[PDB]
Amino acid sequence: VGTNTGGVLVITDTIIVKSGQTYDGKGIKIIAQGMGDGSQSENQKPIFKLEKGANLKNVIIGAPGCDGIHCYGDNVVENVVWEDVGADALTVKSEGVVEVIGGSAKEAADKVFQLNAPCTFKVKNFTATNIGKLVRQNGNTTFKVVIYLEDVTLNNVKSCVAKSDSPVSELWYHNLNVNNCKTLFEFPSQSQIHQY
Template structure:
């Protein structure tokens, strides 16, 4: 049974570092870690931060989408305050009637959720036909979040030196891209994600008004039926890493472009790995082409959420 709740939620512009506890276990303010990048074949060194939080209570990568039992309709974009944790309890969240326009870049006001610096969002399903899914306006954690049908972007990073961590979750039918990096000198770290049918898995903005080096580390993911895993701008020093990935019917790993800050179409300069920007090796970094439905590197929590299987009645994998 689908229940629609119309919530008139005004944007909460909270800049305080105080933690707002919206979960059973409590949220916590995330401390920024500005560390070096590491060499080819390594993860971005900020990956070590994964060990500084409680162990995830959900498995990943999961190759089946959750079944939502309730839909929450938000009249306005929901702002998760700075330092707060929002736990959606695996409900589906969407805006009224949706507003998908694949030809237009959405604004913060078009997103279902905006995350203020230090926010965490977890156990959320983003419904279909939403112009924008989630915008991270500063450092943020995105855990076990699922996009049922991506329109323009699923998750967009903004802000200065934004550290964005994605653990688990999945997205499908992203005609354009799943992860968009519009930040000024940020880092994207994506672990345990499942992508099904997409244009680009990750994209560093090629024509933003403000440009800088961006860094993406993608590991332990399953990606099927996509055009490419990443687009980067070597002229701004972007770095892209891919490790322990199972991919199937994905034509290109990395596309390289000459980005600009005048909002014109970036110039394509090539594809494939190198020793400075596209830092991956299909053999040593265990990038397996061809996915038969069996996930080879599954994380299974010691203390899973008690209600978890309720939303995966047919199991987590094929």
């Protein structure tokens, strides 16, 4: 809850958060129009583009989730709720540290989080329900990401919690609770998965 709770911002183009800015929604809900349908199609725009060092906080992203939130690194995404994930909820598009802290995501047909560049990706105090995967390192990429899942609770994970084809990436978990998931991690070695 914040001072904008009960308000909805209807957008027709991606919100760009410039480097060094924190976009604080104060509880506002964002609904994108003409930017996608939230399907898995690749002809959608992101709701948000966070330049390097931009932060986002306290927004609810309504359906359609479109192409979610494009992060160009060193971003904090705090108390963001994806009421219905689109193609994906958030994508790391450039190198850096990206932290998703608080909030939740719901109804991701595929992945919630998509890692397309080397990064440290931390998901903290987050719940997700009805998802295909929580985190996917871009398919067949072999750069390194380090994933931290800390105080993450997942419900109904169709594929796996996290998948990477990189032999060098790592996944660190601490209080990761997973209900209804056949396979936790799909990495080249279980030695890349660590508890802390």
